[PDB]
C-alpha cells in the first residue's frame, strides 16, 4: 500500500478502496462512514473548483491585466456582481445538491463527450485536484507574506534561488498585503 | 493595412479544418 508517510501505518477506516486513499487521516475526520461519502464529494468539488481557480489566477496575470488579487477591482466586479453570480450559480448548485451523497453521479455526472472515463482518469482528477488545492493555499499565503504577484514570486525564485525563497521572505514583518 | 487580431482569430479557427482532415488522411494511409 502506497501511503502518504513512510512506516506502513494506515487508519482502519481508510482501507484502500476509494480513489486517493493514501492512509492519510491523522485527525480521524473520516472515521464515521456517512461523513466519509459527503467528504468524498466535497474533495472532488473543492478540487475541480481550485483547478479552475489556479488556471484563472495565472492566465490574466500572464496577459498583463493585473494579478489575481487585483483583478476584480481592475475590471469592476463589486459585491453586487458576486451576488448576481451567486444567485445564478445557485440553480445548478441546488440541482446538484438534490441528489444523495451515495449516488456515483454526485461526483461523476456523466458529461463525457470524448469517453475518457477510466480509473486512471479518476485518480488523475483527484491528484491534480489536491495539487491545485495546495496551490491555491500557496497563492493566498504568498500573497500576504511576499506582497507581490505569484508569477513575480516564481520568476524571482528561478533567477535568484537563494535570494528569494521562503526563508528570506519570512524574516521580515510579513503581513504586508 | 495592419491585419487585425480578429483576422488572426478567423485564420486560426479556419486552420483547424485542415488539421482534422490531416488526421483523417493520416489514419487512412496508416492501414
Amino acid at each position: 500500500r502506497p501511503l502518504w508517510f513512510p512506516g506502513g501505518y494506515a487508519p482502519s477506516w481508510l482501507t484502500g478502496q476509494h480513489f486517493g486513499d493514501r492512509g492519510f487521516d491523522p485527525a480521524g475526520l473520516a472515521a464515521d462512514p456517512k461523513v466519509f461519502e459527503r467528504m468524498r464529494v466535497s474533495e472532488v468539488y473543492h478540487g475541480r473548483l481550485a483547478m479552475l481557480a489556479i488556471v484563472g489566477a495565472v492566465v490574466p496575470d500572464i496577459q498583463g491585466k493585473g494579478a489575481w488579487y487585483e483583478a476584480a477591482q481592475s475590471a469592476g466586479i463589486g459585491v453586487n456582481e458576486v451576488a448576481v453570480f451567486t444567485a445564478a450559480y445557485g440553480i445548478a448548485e441546488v440541482a446538484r445538491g438534490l441528489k444523495a451523497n451515495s449516488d456515483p453521479t454526485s461526483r461523476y455526472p456523466g458529461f463525457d463527450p470524448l469517453n475518457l472515463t477510466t480509473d486512471y482518469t479518476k485518480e488523475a482528477e483527484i491528484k491534480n485536484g489536491r495539487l491545485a488545492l495546495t496551490a491555491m493555499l500557496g497563492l493566498e499565503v504568498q500573497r500576504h507574506v511576499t506582497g507581490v504577484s505569484p508569477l513575480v514570486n516564481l520568476v524571482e525564485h528561478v533567477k535568484h534561488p537563494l535570494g528569494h525563497n521562503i526563508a528570506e521572505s519570512v524574516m521580515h514583518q510579513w503581513p504586508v498585503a | 493595412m495592419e491585419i487585425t487580431t480578429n483576422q488572426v482569430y478567423i485564420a486560426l479557427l479556419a486552420s483547424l479544418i485542415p488539421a482534422f482532415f490531416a488526421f483523417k488522411l493520416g489514419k487512412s494511409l496508416n492501414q
Binding site: 475590471a75 453521479t105 455526472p109 456523466g110 458529461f111 | 487580431t5 480578429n6 482569430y9
Partner: protein
Amino acid sequence: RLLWIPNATPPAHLTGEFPGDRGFDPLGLAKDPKVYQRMRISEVFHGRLAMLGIVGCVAPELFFSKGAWFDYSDYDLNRLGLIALQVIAPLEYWRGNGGFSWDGNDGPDRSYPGFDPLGLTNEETKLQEIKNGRLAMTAMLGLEVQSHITGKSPLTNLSEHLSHPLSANLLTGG
C-alpha cells in the same frame, strides 16, 4: 443509445432507429408512428431551408460587399413575393403530392427523392444532414433574435464579440 442530456430516460416512442434520435421529446409530440413520420419530413425540410438561409444571409455580405440581410429597403416585397410564390407553388405541391400524376405516389421517398448524381446516400450522410440542419436552424434563430436586439449585421456581431469578449455579450447587449 446517444442522449441529449446525461443520465436521461429515452422516451418509448423514440426507439434509436431513425437518424438523429437522441431521446429528446419532453412534450411528447411523436407518439404515433404517422405523426412522427410527418414531423420527420418537416424536420429535414426545415433543416435544408435553414442551411440555404444561413448561407444566403452570411455569404452575400462577407463575399459580395452587400449589406445586412434585414435591410429590405431595396425592393418591393409584394412583387418578389408574387413572383416567388408563382415559381414555388408547383415545386412545393409536387413535393407534397409525390409526383406529377393526380394521385401522385410515383416512386420517390418524399424526403429522400434520389437527387444524387454522385451516389452518396447512407445512414451516416443522413445523420450529417440532420445535425447540420439542426445547427443551421439554431443559427437562423440566433440571426433573427440578434437582429432584433443589436440591430447590427451578424458579422458585425461576431467582430464585436471577438474584439471585446467581456462587454459584447448577450448579458450586455453588445
